[PDB]
Curated annotation (Swiss-Prot), chain B:
HAMAP family noted in UniProt: ThyX
Binding site for dUMP: Q73, W74, F75, R76, E84, L85, S86, G87, R88, R145, R172
Keyword Transmembrane helix belongs to the record: no
Effect of R88A: Binds dUMP 670-fold weaker than wild-type
Residue ranges annotated as motif ThyX motif: 76-86
Note: Reaction mechanism involved a direct methylene transfer from mTHF to dUMP. FDTS ionizes N3 of dUMP using the active-site Arg-172, providing a new mechanism for dUMP activation. The phosphate of dUMP is crucial for flavin oxidation, suggesting that it acts as the base that deprotonates C5 of the dUMP-methylene adduct. A later study showed that FAD is first reduced by NADPH. Then, the reduced flavin, FADH(-), reacts with mTHF to form a carbinolamine flavin, which acts as the genuine methylene donor.
Family: Belongs to the thymidylate synthase ThyX family.
Cofactor requirement: FAD
Root EC class: transferase
Protein name: Flavin-dependent thymidylate synthase
CDD domains attached to this UniProt entry: ThyX
Residue pairs linked by disulfide bridges in the UniProt entry: none
Effect of H51A: Shows 1.39% of wild-type activity
Length: 218, 217, 212
């Protein structure tokens, strides 16, 4: 069971996986039926020459809890399946991402980093209180929720294949992506490396365009 | 590793599956967490109201051997993964689909159905022999193969989710589709029913647009 | 309508196009807008921000043998509609390679004899098809004996990003020669309608060899 905590209340949990490195080998050769040195050489060959389609036969299902600003960027990856918690089939919860003062250390600010954390905490408390007041007064949830901030946490199931997951890592596991989604991508890369060590090693060696996966050990 | 033989030399083999009916239940509720009657009611609810996205979290991998005319129609389903045998990583084989005379029974023909079967075998034998002669003479395979007929068998891996598989069944498991692909679709439906009984039953009950799955068991 | 003849009887014809290089500029800025716009196209291409190129769409009418079409139809991020004979007239023509196609390979029989042997077997298969049709065998059954060089026609609606992926794979010497010819025609039409995008693609993103 793999569950990695992210940010202050998030997580990336592995729900299920179909296949391993050999699923890509089996799909490339088109045979059910092996040989570590030969099959690992095939994985590297496929990656080096751009034959990425065999990697689509390795599938993962994740359960991610993330703030709406992180989820909005994540959901931009169209070649995947998503099902977000809406409150139609299960209980809806209300938590927010408050950045720690360490997040701001590095930027020259006129007010202490701690004070920024305080100001953020304060406005989300006010918006949440306003939401509850509107709910208590009979305003439908769909209307009342529009005042809630972008740091509101949401939960979703993500079903994605290894090829689309590698595209996600190229873009999100990189210093140009927002720090919050970099953290989420590191957790995805960690679970991916655990289930597909050969594919992950070949990806870093031949196809990976980002920077943080070659520096940070997953 | 269920295998179903289709036609004279083809097959549909289940390579792998991720999840079951509960994977759609887990995705709809968004929880990795005991009432079969309540879970089956949710599957039926999702299917009646058109909330099909939870069914995308059930994935199948099939190994299919089919003639190129069947594969060309199959490969039109874009929301899926495919990897066909080309001869770059494994041995290439040469076999052909010869329809049995029973395939023609139902159509009033001027020549016996056995004569149609014979005419088809004759053509593949001559075309295949011509291919081998050109190969033996030093003509590259990519050129010599262009004379091979559409009934040449091919093999491929198909990775598809339950929602896209249900779209495939709506179109191919239907009397308006070619008989050959209907057989292949019946094998896919059989494997699907075995792994996802609740989803398959709900699909026939509310979402299935075809006709042969409601007649053939 | 641009039109390029490929092989003995095939073609690549431009049916329609939505947008130009500025459609990618407009989508990237989320605006309605010369040296700055071309610099943006090159920037987008060199940094991998490919999504603005999805807002340039093309529609092609392609006549190609089934062996070429089978590889083409593998590109899933596109729209296709092939002639089946349900709404319009079905035609039967075949790709016969010219002797020049075999020049370069040491063959035991002359290249003209290979061309002849190919015409012969496709004539026999086509005649067998017509005999089965005349005898009352449904087209869907009789056609299974037709060879892979039988020409088909289809409409292809694809955006510039997916078209660039197609060029990376098909406009390359490792692809079959017949496929290279069709990809050259697609690249030619693309260059004509999107000169800046095509030049930037060639400069930074293009992985193949024959377009350079
Ligand atoms: C430098 C830079 C700058 C920006 C941005 C990216 C980058 C790298 N983006 C983000 C961008 O628009 C997009 O959301 C992500 O790059 C999504 O990654 P994919 O397209 O790979 O994922 P996705 O899952 O959508 O696609 C995966 C792969 O499938 C293919 N694909 C899928 N759907 C396709 C389609 N419809 N047509 C063609 N190919 C398709 C492509 O090969 C693609 O890489 C952006 N966004 C934004 O809204 N505003 C902005 O200003 C920017 N800025
Ligand atoms: C009754 C009900 C209830 C809910 C919801 C829908 C409905 C009808 N939704 C919304 C739903 O999950 C979905 O995001 C949108 O309806 C988008 O619809 P498509 O996926 O059809 O469009 P999209 O544009 O993504 O795709 C168009 C079509 O392509 C196909 N398709 C695309 N990608 C596919 C893939 N990967 N596999 C298979 N087929 C694919 C399908 O045929 C689809 O209709 C939802 N959402 C949520 O997150 N939580 C919720 O609680 C609910 N609740
Ligand atoms: C009555 C009739 C007649 C014909 C045909 C079908 C039918 C029902 N066909 C076959 C048809 O064109 C098609 O190739 C297959 O039915 C594939 O169906 P999908 O596109 O639904 O599957 P696929 O698996 O590709 O897509 C699944 C779902 O995703 C969505 N989808 C995927 N890609 C999309 C995109 N780019 N834009 C929008 N939605 C997208 C759709 O919602 C679709 O149902 C045909 N074919 C042909 O070439 N010539 C013919 O003459 C005919 N004739
Ligand atoms: C060296 C080499 C060798 C081979 C092959 C290719 C190469 C480069 N192929 C061809 C290959 O399988 C494939 O059909 C083409 O490369 C099509 O490219 P795309 O998937 O990019 O196009 P497509 O148009 O399908 O998709 C465009 C882009 O969208 C994304 N994409 C689309 N659908 C996706 C999905 N479901 N999951 C993830 N990403 C998706 C990808 O980013 C992709 O580049 C092959 N073929 C074969 O059948 N057998 C073989 O042996 C070989 N051999």
């Amino acid at each position: 069971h793999m569950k990695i905590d992210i940010l202050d209340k998030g997580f990336v949990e592995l729900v299920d996986v179909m296949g391993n490195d050999l699923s890509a080998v089996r799909a490339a050769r088109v045979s059910f039926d092996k040989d570590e040195e030969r099959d690992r050489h095939l994985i590297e060959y496929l990656m080096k020459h751009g034959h990425e389609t065999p990697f689509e036969h390795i599938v993962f299902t994740f359960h991610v809890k993330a703030p709406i600003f992180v989820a909005r960027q994540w959901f931009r990856h169209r070649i995947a399946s998503y099902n977000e918690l809406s409150g139609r089939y299960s209980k809806l919860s209300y938590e927010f991402y408050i950045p720690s003062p360490e997040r701001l250390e590095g930027y020259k600010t006129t007010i202490p980093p701690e004070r920024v954390t305080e100001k953020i905490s304060e406005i989300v408390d006010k918006a949440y209180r306003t939401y509850l007041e509107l709910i208590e007064s009979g305003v439908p949830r769909e209307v009342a929720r529009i005042v809630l901030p972008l740091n509101l946490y949401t939960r979703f199931f993500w079903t994605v294949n290894a090829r689309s997951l590698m595209n996600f890592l190229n873009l999100r596991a990189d210093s140009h992506a927002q720090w919050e989604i970099q953290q989420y991508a590191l957790a995805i890369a960690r679970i991916f490396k655990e289930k597909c060590p050969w594919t992950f090693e070949a990806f870093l060696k031949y196809a990976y365009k980002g920077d943080i996966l070659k520096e940070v050990q997953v």
